[PDB]
Write a protein that binds this ligand. Structure first.
Ligand SMILES: OC[C@H]1O[C@H](O[C@H]2[C@H](O)[C@@H](O)[C@@H](O)O[C@@H]2CO)[C@H](O)[C@@H](O)[C@@H]1O
Length: 607
């Protein structure tokens, strides 16, 4: 990659001539040349060429591809300052966050709308179900009802998702519950639970945990009734830290015993006093996994009144030989928030200051096991967790010693084993589409060019497209409207919402130049206007400019369809999702197999 200039890749359906104008302004101010290209298949080309250390400085695509690029080490982390972050909408920054890092600049929000010819169809349809009849009426007059790209599953997905189709199931319960039981003959507690570790490229690695805790001291402890600890964890990194490390934020609350009405009728351990405020924490772990010896040190603080832990861990021996997420559980349940009515069940604090021994065995399914023994106690003002870990029977090339686990915890934000492409709602929607074809209301071979030319020539009354398409319709002089997509079985069509984003190649020697361009030239009112005037971007990420665009009814329609849809995940598994659904739609549409069979195939490919 040549130093001292910028090469930018953007898709050929976007305003690349307008983006080139912004490049020319950058060159007028700086002397630096900005070359804008639109290669074919750039979303497949980029990971190929970047993996060898080549390609553009800056890559534009919808946000859904960027997680995969990021997981493959192809994107530089961006760290705009807070003054710049405040210029863009938070919804858009969320779309470019990946396992704790911002991995691109967001540009604009894209959602499909129904685009209609007001001369042919002054009142467009509310439902998919009425389209066959409208088509029959229009065909009698030499026109058709609807043409849109049937080759890319982006454009059929709104109908597939309408009555219940989905890619990956969003985890609505992000806390993980660990059930605590009294262990009377150890005068302590025990627990067993499992952790899910997403594997890169798909699949889940299970870690079955078995735990026993015993007081160090001879003083009385609290032995609890059955209950649980509900834990949420967030793993991140410190941009200024050069060693191998993990930043961890956790929140933990006890639950599972409801107060009875008898307790209202006519209606704390000494160790608990040590946890009324912020307590410093130190963690030290000496480990040996298949003979690979390592040490970890951690420091931070706990606040049991919130159930909150904030810690940074460092591998003090160089590269950690196992993945960080596999050590989270091993690396202080005394910081749990127990509700007042449950505090007689808090073994962990009752054992302080002398502390407890915490022992586990952790079995990684179809791989090795960890055995851990820890002393958790106060040393002065500080709560210290000192751990010995021994790992055996691991595969040197397996998910743990081969570092094949995603950097997230307990499955992350989507259940990548729960795919919705072959459920009743997906089948109903694709069956409707295939029926449209069977009944000669659409043609299986229609693609983007064919549909755009028919709509822009006034041959078809409707199309389905994004904001980028509007300028060619303008040139055509068709009198058009942009509106809400039709309903299916009374439910909104649910387009997958994209955020056009600009990522920086990890191998670029022009990372600062790229940030200067993106922050001070593109992501300005004048920069966005220049692209927008070429091909409309949609609902832009820059607040100041979006305030001008919201008076356009086409933007209002875009937003209404975005609201009814769902933001695309940016998880690495999205690439497999889209490949599978593409094949399923093309095959079902051309009659190659039935709808049921094709969606079942898709589902098997993805999982
Ligand atoms: O069809 C699968 C395809 O859908 C999306 O791509 C969109 C893109 O977001 C729009 O900006 C535009 O160019 O149309 C594309 C459909 O042809 C996903 O972003 C993409 O990853 C996916 O492969």
């Amino acid at each position: 990659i040549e130093e001292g200039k910028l090469v930018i890749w953007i898709n050929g359906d976007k305003g690349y001539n307008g983006l080139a104008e912004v490049g020319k302004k950058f060159e007028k101010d700086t002397g630096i040349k900005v070359t804008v290209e639109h290669p074919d298949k750039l979303e497949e080309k980029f990971p190929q060429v970047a993996a060898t250390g080549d390609g553009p400085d800056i890559i534009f695509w919808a946000h859904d591809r960027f997680g995969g690029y990021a997981q493959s080490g192809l994107l530089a982390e961006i760290t705009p300052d807070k003054a710049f972050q405040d210029k863009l909408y938070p919804f858009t920054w969320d779309a470019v966050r990946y396992n704790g890092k911002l991995i691109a600049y967001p540009i604009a929000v894209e959602a499909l709308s129904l685009i209609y010819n007001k001369d042919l169809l002054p009142n467009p349809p509310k439902t998919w179900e009425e389209i066959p009849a409208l088509d029959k009426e229009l065909k009698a007059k030499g026109k058709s009802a609807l043409m849109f790209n049937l080759q890319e599953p982006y454009f059929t997905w709104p109908l597939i998702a309408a009555d219940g189709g989905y890619a990956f199931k969003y985890e609505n319960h992000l806390s993980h519950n660990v059930y605590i039981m009294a262990d009377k003959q150890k005068n302590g507690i025990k627990a067993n639970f499992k952790i899910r570790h997403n594997i890169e490229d798909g699949g889940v690695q299970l870690a079955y945990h078995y735990q026993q805790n015993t007081p160090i001291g001879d003083g009385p402890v609290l032995l609890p009734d059955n209950h649980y600890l509900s834990t949420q964890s967030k793993l991140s990194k410190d941009p200024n830290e050069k060693r191998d490390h993990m930043v961890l934020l956790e929140f933990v609350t006890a639950a599972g015993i409801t107060l009875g009405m008898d307790e209202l009728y006519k209606g704390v351990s000494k160790g608990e006093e040590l946890f009324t405020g912020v307590v410093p924490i130190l963690v030290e772990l000496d480990g040996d996994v298949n003979g690979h010896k390592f040490s970890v040190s951690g420091e931070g603080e706990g606040d049991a009144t919130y159930g909150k832990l904030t810690l940074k861990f460092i591998c003090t021996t160089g590269k950690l030989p196992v993945p960080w997420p596999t050590l989270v559980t091993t690396l202080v349940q005394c910081f749990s928030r127990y509700p007042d009515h449950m505090k007689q069940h808090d073994f962990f604090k009752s054992a302080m200051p002398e502390g407890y021994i915490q022992e586990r065995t952790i079995f990684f399914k179809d791989d090795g096991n960890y055995k851990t023994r820890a002393e958790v106690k106060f040393e002065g003002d500080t709560l210290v967790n000192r751990i010995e870990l021994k790992g055996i029977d691991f595969k040197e090339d397996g998910n743990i010693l081969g570092h094949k686990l995603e950097y997230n915890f307990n499955g992350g934000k989507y259940d990548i084993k729960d795919v919705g492409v072959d459920n009743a709602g997906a089948k109903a929607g694709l069956t409707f589409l295939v029926d449209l074809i069977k009944n000669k209301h659409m043609n299986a071979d229609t693609d983007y060019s064919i549909a755009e030319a028919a709509f822009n020539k006034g041959e078809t009354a409707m199309t389905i497209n994004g904001p980028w398409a509007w300028s060619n319709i303008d040139t055509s002089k068709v009198n058009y409207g942009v509106t809400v997509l039709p309903t299916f079985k009374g439910q909104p069509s649910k387009p997958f919402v994209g955020v056009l984003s600009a990522g920086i190649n990890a191998a670029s020697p022009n990372k600062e130049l790229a940030k200067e361009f993106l922050e001070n030239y593109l992501l300005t009112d004048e920069g966005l206007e220049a692209v927008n005037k070429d091909k409309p971007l949609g609902a832009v990420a820059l607040k100041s400019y979006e305030e001008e665009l919201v008076k356009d009814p086409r933007i209002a329609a875009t937003m209404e369809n975005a609201q009814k849809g769902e933001i695309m995940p940016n998880i690495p598994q999205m690439s497999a999702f889209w490949y599978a659904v593409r094949t399923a739609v093309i095959n079902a549409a051309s009659g190659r197999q039935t709808v049921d069979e094709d969606l079942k195939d898709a589902q098997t490919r993805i999982t």
